[PDB]
Design an enzyme around this catalytic site. Structure first.
Site, PDB file in Angstrom:
ATOM      1  N   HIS A  41       0.614  -1.233   0.186  1.00 42.48           N
ATOM      2  CA  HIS A  41      -0.119  -0.160   0.030  1.00 42.48           C
ATOM      3  C   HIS A  41       0.380   1.075  -0.221  1.00 42.48           C
ATOM      4  O   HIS A  41       0.458   2.205  -0.338  1.00 42.48           O
ATOM      5  CB  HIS A  41      -1.260   0.023   0.587  1.00 42.48           C
ATOM      6  CG  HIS A  41      -0.417   0.092   2.302  1.00 42.48           C
ATOM      7  ND1 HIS A  41      -0.598  -1.022   3.105  1.00 42.48           N
ATOM      8  CD2 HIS A  41       0.084   0.946   3.117  1.00 42.48           C
ATOM      9  CE1 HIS A  41       0.266  -0.661   4.100  1.00 42.48           C
ATOM     10  NE2 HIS A  41       0.640   0.386   4.596  1.00 42.48           N
ATOM     11  N   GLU A  72       0.675  -8.017   0.265  1.00 44.22           N
ATOM     12  CA  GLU A  72       0.854  -7.446   0.588  1.00 44.22           C
ATOM     13  C   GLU A  72       2.514  -6.794   0.842  1.00 44.22           C
ATOM     14  O   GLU A  72       3.106  -6.104   1.797  1.00 44.22           O
ATOM     15  CB  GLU A  72       0.195  -6.464   2.338  1.00 44.22           C
ATOM     16  CG  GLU A  72      -0.423  -5.844   2.149  1.00 44.22           C
ATOM     17  CD  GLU A  72      -0.834  -4.072   1.844  1.00 44.22           C
ATOM     18  OE1 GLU A  72      -1.632  -4.538   1.285  1.00 44.22           O
ATOM     19  OE2 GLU A  72       0.177  -3.160   2.238  1.00 44.22           O
ATOM     20  N   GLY A 146       2.144   5.126  10.553  1.00 48.08           N
ATOM     21  CA  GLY A 146       3.035   5.478  10.579  1.00 48.08           C
ATOM     22  C   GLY A 146       4.434   4.422  11.211  1.00 48.08           C
ATOM     23  O   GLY A 146       5.211   4.335  10.945  1.00 48.08           O
ATOM     24  N   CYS A 148       4.000   1.392   8.771  1.00 53.45           N
ATOM     25  CA  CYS A 148       3.964   0.126   8.257  1.00 53.45           C
ATOM     26  C   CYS A 148       5.019   0.143   8.415  1.00 53.45           C
ATOM     27  O   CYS A 148       6.385   1.054   7.551  1.00 53.45           O
ATOM     28  CB  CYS A 148       2.618   0.468   7.395  1.00 53.45           C
ATOM     29  SG  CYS A 148       1.528   0.098   7.962  1.00 53.45           S
TER      30      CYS A 148
HETATM   31  C1  LIG Z   1       0.296   1.171   8.074  1.00 54.65           C
HETATM   32  C2  LIG Z   1       0.455   2.534   6.632  1.00 54.65           C
HETATM   33  C3  LIG Z   1      -0.498   3.862   7.285  1.00 54.65           C
HETATM   34  O1  LIG Z   1       0.485   4.425   7.911  1.00 54.65           O
HETATM   35  O2  LIG Z   1      -0.671   4.543   6.484  1.00 54.65           O
HETATM   36  C4  LIG Z   1      -2.576   5.214   6.823  1.00 54.65           C
HETATM   37  C5  LIG Z   1      -2.327   6.821   7.325  1.00 54.65           C
HETATM   38  C6  LIG Z   1      -1.046   1.044   8.545  1.00 54.65           C
HETATM   39  C7  LIG Z   1      -0.867   0.820  10.289  1.00 54.65           C
HETATM   40  C8  LIG Z   1      -2.375   1.007  11.031  1.00 54.65           C
HETATM   41  C9  LIG Z   1      -2.706   2.556  11.070  1.00 54.65           C
HETATM   42  C10 LIG Z   1      -4.279   2.037  12.369  1.00 54.65           C
HETATM   43  N1  LIG Z   1      -2.715   0.973  13.080  1.00 54.65           N
HETATM   44  C11 LIG Z   1      -2.136   0.302  12.046  1.00 54.65           C
HETATM   45  O3  LIG Z   1      -1.326  -0.696  12.437  1.00 54.65           O
HETATM   46  N2  LIG Z   1      -1.239   0.505   8.041  1.00 54.65           N
HETATM   47  C12 LIG Z   1      -2.555   0.507   7.194  1.00 54.65           C
HETATM   48  O4  LIG Z   1      -3.783   1.805   8.057  1.00 54.65           O
HETATM   49  C13 LIG Z   1      -3.269  -0.477   6.469  1.00 54.65           C
HETATM   50  C14 LIG Z   1      -3.943   0.344   5.041  1.00 54.65           C
HETATM   51  C15 LIG Z   1      -3.740   0.228   4.241  1.00 54.65           C
HETATM   52  C16 LIG Z   1      -5.636   0.523   3.243  1.00 54.65           C
HETATM   53  C17 LIG Z   1      -5.541   0.283   1.700  1.00 54.65           C
HETATM   54  C18 LIG Z   1      -4.879  -1.210   1.630  1.00 54.65           C
HETATM   55  C19 LIG Z   1      -4.166  -1.281   2.361  1.00 54.65           C
HETATM   56  C20 LIG Z   1      -3.910  -0.764   3.221  1.00 54.65           C
HETATM   57  N3  LIG Z   1      -4.874  -0.433   7.005  1.00 54.65           N
HETATM   58  C21 LIG Z   1      -5.188  -1.005   8.324  1.00 54.65           C
HETATM   59  O5  LIG Z   1      -4.280  -1.400   9.004  1.00 54.65           O
HETATM   60  C22 LIG Z   1      -6.497  -0.948   8.897  1.00 54.65           C
HETATM   61  C23 LIG Z   1      -6.815  -2.684   9.078  1.00 54.65           C
HETATM   62  C24 LIG Z   1      -5.957  -3.689   8.568  1.00 54.65           C
HETATM   63  C25 LIG Z   1      -8.483  -3.287   8.477  1.00 54.65           C
END
Ligand SMILES: */C(=C/C(=O)OCC)[C@H](C[C@@H]1CCNC1=O)NC(=O)[C@H](Cc1ccccc1)NC(=O)CC(C)C
Length: 181
Positions: A41, A72, A146, A148
């Protein structure tokens, strides 16, 4: 210094970088030669910012399984002179659990950050903001935006890349060595 702390610090120094795509800030794992991995993503383009400079991306491979389902992960080959310290031998041949893992994050906003996520268990299927995703593992820690790309680590092994969370638990895409062959 102890061996566990030495391993994570050395990973941070040699293999885990601060990056930015159009989607924002991510931790990048450098695996060997010019080969690195990001969460899918993050949508890396033709260039990606890496620590303090714009780096050309020569190729990008989005990993799917046999059923065609999202894993992913995106493999990227970089146009650089550096060859990453080769860490493939710390990646298990199969996606593997761990006790007391540590999540190593490295972003401009969250530099050299260690998050003690606890045990990492098989999870499998995950719905990721609409996208079905296979081969994930879970840790009961309330990970956040933040983080990821963070590298899930335990006893000198590199086992996953952080990809999401639900406010209560966190989820990584599992690593296996053959993605990097
Ligand atoms: C990592 C990416 C990020 O920060 O971008 C969003 C602004 C994020 C970490 C998550 C957020 C809440 N707690 C966490 O550990 N990952 C995501 O936000 C995932 C985003 C995504 C959207 C569409 C396609 C792929 C990835 N989504 C999630 O964590 C939500 C649930 C697993 C459904």
């Amino acid at each position: 210094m102890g061996p566990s702390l030495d391993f994570a610090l050395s990973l941070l120094r040699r293999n885990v970088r601060q990056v930015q795509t159009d989607q924002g800030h991510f931790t990048m794992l450098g695996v060997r030669d010019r080969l690195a991995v990001l969460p899918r993503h993050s949508q890396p383009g033709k260039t990606i910012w890496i620590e303090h400079k714009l780096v050309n991306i020569l190729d990008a491979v989005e990993l799917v399984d046999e059923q065609g389902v999202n894993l992913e992960l995106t493999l990227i080959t970089l146009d650089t002179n550096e060859k990453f310290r080769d860490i493939t031998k710390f990646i298990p041949e199969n996606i593997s659990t761990a006790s007391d893992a540590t999540l190593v994050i490295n972003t401009e906003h969250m530099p050299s950050m260690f998050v003690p996520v606890g045990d990492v268990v098989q999870y499998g299927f995950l719905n990721l903001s609409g996208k079905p995703t296979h081969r994930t593992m879970m840790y009961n820690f309330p990970t956040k935006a933040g983080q990821c790309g963070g590298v899930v680590t335990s006893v000198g092994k590199v086992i996953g890349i952080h990809i999401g969370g639900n406010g209560r638990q966190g989820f990584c895409a599992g690593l296996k060595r053959s993605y990097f062959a």
